[PDB]
Design a protein around this ligand. Sequence first.
Ligand SMILES: CCCCCCCCCCCCCCCC(=O)O
Ligand SMILES: Nc1nc2[nH]cnc2c(=O)[nH]1
Lengths: 247, 261, 38, 38, 38, 238, 238, 238
Amino acid sequence: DRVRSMTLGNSTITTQESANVVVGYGEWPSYLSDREATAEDQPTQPDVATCRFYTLESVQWEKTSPGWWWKFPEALKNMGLFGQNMHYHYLGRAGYTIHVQCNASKFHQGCLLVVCVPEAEMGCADTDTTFPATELTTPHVFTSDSITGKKVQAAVCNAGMGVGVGNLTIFPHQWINLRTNNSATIVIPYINSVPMDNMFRHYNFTLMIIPFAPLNFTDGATAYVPITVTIAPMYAEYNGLRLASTQ
Amino acid sequence: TVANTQPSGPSNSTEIPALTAVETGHTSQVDPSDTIQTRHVVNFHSRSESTIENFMGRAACVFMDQYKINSTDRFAVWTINIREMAQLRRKCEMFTYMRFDIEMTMVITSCQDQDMPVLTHQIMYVPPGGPIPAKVDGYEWQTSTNPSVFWTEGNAPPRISIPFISVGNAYSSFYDGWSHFTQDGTYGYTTLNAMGKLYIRHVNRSSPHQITSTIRVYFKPKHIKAWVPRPPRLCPYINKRDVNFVVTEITDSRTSITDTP
Amino acid sequence: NFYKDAASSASNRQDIQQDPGKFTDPVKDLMIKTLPAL
Amino acid sequence: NFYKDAASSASNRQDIQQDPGKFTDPVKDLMIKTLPAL
Amino acid sequence: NFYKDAASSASNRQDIQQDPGKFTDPVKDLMIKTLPAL
Amino acid sequence: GVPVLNTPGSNQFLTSDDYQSPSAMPQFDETPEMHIPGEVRNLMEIAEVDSVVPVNNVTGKTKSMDAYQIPVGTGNTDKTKPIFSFQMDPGYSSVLKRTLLGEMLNYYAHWSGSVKLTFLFCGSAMATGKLLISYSPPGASVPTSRKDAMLGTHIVWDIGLQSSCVLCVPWISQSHYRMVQQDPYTSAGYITCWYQTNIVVPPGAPTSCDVLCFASACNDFSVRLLRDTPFMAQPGKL
Amino acid sequence: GVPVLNTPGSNQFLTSDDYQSPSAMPQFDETPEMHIPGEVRNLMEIAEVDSVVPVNNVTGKTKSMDAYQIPVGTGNTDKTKPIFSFQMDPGYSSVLKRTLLGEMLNYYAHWSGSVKLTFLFCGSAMATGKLLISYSPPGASVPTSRKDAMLGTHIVWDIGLQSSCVLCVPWISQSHYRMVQQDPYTSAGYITCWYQTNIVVPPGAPTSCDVLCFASACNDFSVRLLRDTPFMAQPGKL
Amino acid sequence: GVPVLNTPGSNQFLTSDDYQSPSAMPQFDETPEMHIPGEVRNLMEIAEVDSVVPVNNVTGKTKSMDAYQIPVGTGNTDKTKPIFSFQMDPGYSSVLKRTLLGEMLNYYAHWSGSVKLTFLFCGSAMATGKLLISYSPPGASVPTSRKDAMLGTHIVWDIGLQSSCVLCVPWISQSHYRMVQQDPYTSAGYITCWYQTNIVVPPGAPTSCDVLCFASACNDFSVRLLRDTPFMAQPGKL
Ligand SMILES: CCCCCCCCCCCCCCCC(=O)O
Ligand SMILES: Nc1nc2[nH]cnc2c(=O)[nH]1
């Protein structure tokens, strides 16, 4: 039960050392029902053009790297037809199979926390101002210090949202322990207070990858150990066609 | 009630309850009946007081402001939010989405800075977009369709029930998103907080001496449904319109890893 | 119930429900306590 | 009902009735949505 | 009973019970009033 | 007698309460009920009735009749320019805040449902044309060309014997209700009109016509949170 | 009318009461209920979820990531010294007062049930070892040797493919509940860790590894007396 | 709502009332009930238990052990003199106001039923005797001779193997209850002891023995009107 495969919309994912997929809060994503819907317009359901695996830019994991975060759905804009249906539609749902994968040898050690946090409302570096939208969204890095300026407070102990970073285990999450597994798959149903929401101005969840045990290896092992994020929306549907937004 | 402890004996077998893998995102479901030898004990302990209705169902102070009798300091205005005070904020910033309807209780205590006759207070609530009064003889105060409470001192505190008045299927404690569609303007939960201002004044026309009343609003959530739990707040509450923070130590320190009192 | 409105009612403190399975073990493949994890 | 008088009673807020046909289409000759107006 | 909580109730003054046998004669071997003690 | 306990909220006056009160005039014989034509039992009966929309409310035309009529002409210039354009939210929009839809909507804080815009063409019987009336949900800017506007929920309206057309704004919203006041979180889209072809008129007919606009609610329309209207603005004693 | 008698407690405001109150907004149409994933109905659902325990919270490592990781090495020195040691009571203990178990426990005055400590080994796949994690109830001092610590409820944890182990602290108490605050009458025991054998590592693997600790509640865990948390400590107006 | 009428006694605080009051801690999970040995459900269970009576409470023997023991000797002098004599009313009598019968009786104003006095002889096994313990109801003076005392309800107690005797004071009263405080209308009789024959002791045994007295209630004993005890007499802040 360590080997697993995920095939979505002409893109399959192979893993051979992995924990089983974690279904966020025990709910598998699905299309919006007729009783819980709010928009009387026929939604667009391109199941194979958008609901497929998209591979983000990989990041180098070093001995002193604090962590990273992505903000979805927005991070998936201008990527395939999933980003084109954002610009032309006003509403959207998805279910985001998140496949974070980081391989190593049996002579490397380290432990990542791959956690999906719904509504990770970040905090500004200077407590009396507001920071631009380019700060939130090459994933932004945490820092093992305290930054100052018109930035998101990207310290690691307070994970950006101002909590204990060890208490991020309450969210749907996995661990990549390099002796056990080299990938972590999290399935996230559509979590929001509203049945459909705009995908640009609203970040439904953020993906935080935080090494609790840092990477360590002796001389001779490969120093370049990259972390690759492969996110695939599921059961994505759109509503409210209009002219394309320039963003 | 909570689960009883089943009796176990000495075991020597190829089954391993203690051996787990945390990296599966899985919390082990083991009991003390799996690790050691236990006796049969009947647990009559219940989890009745840890429920969300009992936890959140206590009236917490959410607003204090003064308004004087005999200008704009003659009446109070609140523009309703939970974020005014820290203790109820940390309970509500513990769940991402939560759906409840609240009753509010006012504690109005007038204090002299010549004898006050009797003080009658008006707590007028304007839903968002309504006409705001800029004076005590505003004309707004007549409440044709605004809810309003008239209270004279020396009586029970004014308690009225409020429904779930949110536009969305739940109140959102956190909103990781922007106000405008171009990702601009106001960031955070402030955008979602569209609940009307709360206006409090003395319906007494004047007074022979300066009387300063203070109001204390106590929300108590009831019929509570909460979704997506999140960790409690660690660092303090610098602002009211944003979750901004100074970085703080995660836990109190020790001198050594072995050191213990 | 002395009022028609449902928000104008007593708090339903009596009911006690819980589903800790959606937080402690949200995994797809069932994991037995007895068996090894992998 | 604690009083004999009918004006000394609670407001009958519960009932919900409506007949928008006497304002939106008060016409004599019935007009079908499908058909042309004339 | 106008409250759900059991501590928020009237004092149960009405009930009258007593077992003075556990204080006046706690002895193991039964002692008859008629018979000598030893 | 029976032991009672005074809870909070005693001896208060909540204005929106439902209590019984002693009658000042006991055993009063009311006037017998009579059937008066046109009983309204719900305010959404009288918000679903059409009402002319002052679309041309430019500076200098509001206190007149020219506010209601939309100038539509026959020419070669400015056929790639909108005929009109305004906010779709009937509470704060400076065009349809005063309609019967907007007058009954400003007593409320939340509103849901579809609104529909009816366009009466008030030209001659010989003048024919085609118009594109489009609705585009928010998220992007106002459509600046007819190409960008025909991507929203539009209708191409041929002008003939019927001479009237209904654009039903289909309630594409994220939430179940929207704020009547103007806030970014729940803002309605844009209603623009364009020339599909042109207005074509015979030699002797007047070449400058005008479209008259209407707006009402659909059958799924509802208002949700009572508040006071901001329009009246009493200054003092009458 | 009916003769009534006003008892004590009338016209008071008890904050934790259960009374009916008149609705300010009668006949309000609430937003229809929708299914949001992950409904929590009890706070002991979210205290039974694991959370990383800052065991290495020495002076200078708390405001960092090194607070969570427990240094475990391969050497000849200090193999008769504990790896860690801390109080078992999750309310006042300077190690696990901040965990999810300790955050939800500090809103309460009394607590009952078994807690369990899960230890994730974050070394290499070739490095193997054995560890003794022991719990000793109060009454004696802290165990100072592994001989004194293997008399309590311990576990010898072989480190291999599973790479994780659960020490269930079995709730050996005199009373049914314990105080969350620190008092002598109801004080929990001690959780010490020892080297059963050693950590053995191949020539090319890194010789300094670390154990990562977890803590959560069992299914028989309950909290009993609501109080305010001491952590927030508001100084003034925000 | 329903018309009510506030009677006298509203908004008062009577200390001995039976009203329901709102719970400060709703849905509180109490500690499970456990069986503790020796549950007392009535204070007349613990007034019917014997208790040693300080009959010899003369000046200089009260703050000692000699208050409890009654000196009984073997001689030729003073065999027509009482051994002891005291009031039978267990509330104000300076002998049995402090017994367990008198401690639980001083919380009450009225009392009814029979009390019984048990006399344990604490001499040697070879010393034998006979004693006359008599009760005489009021109306006359204290019996000054054994002739006048054997007219009341007496008992001639032979001292042997049993070594204990019970004088049941038979509740000869005019009314159903008596005052615990000392008033002439309801005053109990007198309990005197006399030598029936003598105490006879062998040559080598100690010639001065002593009788130890007890007092408890019977099964028909009851107390009737709650009041405060006068013994505690707090002076000020503790
Ligand atoms: C005199 C009339 C008083 C009426 C007062 C109405 C109060 C509005 C409802 C309270 C708002 C609750 C918002 C909670 C949002 C969150 O949980 O973050
Ligand atoms: N493939 C798949 N479909 C589902 N539909 C509901 N649950 C599931 C699931 O767990 N897996």
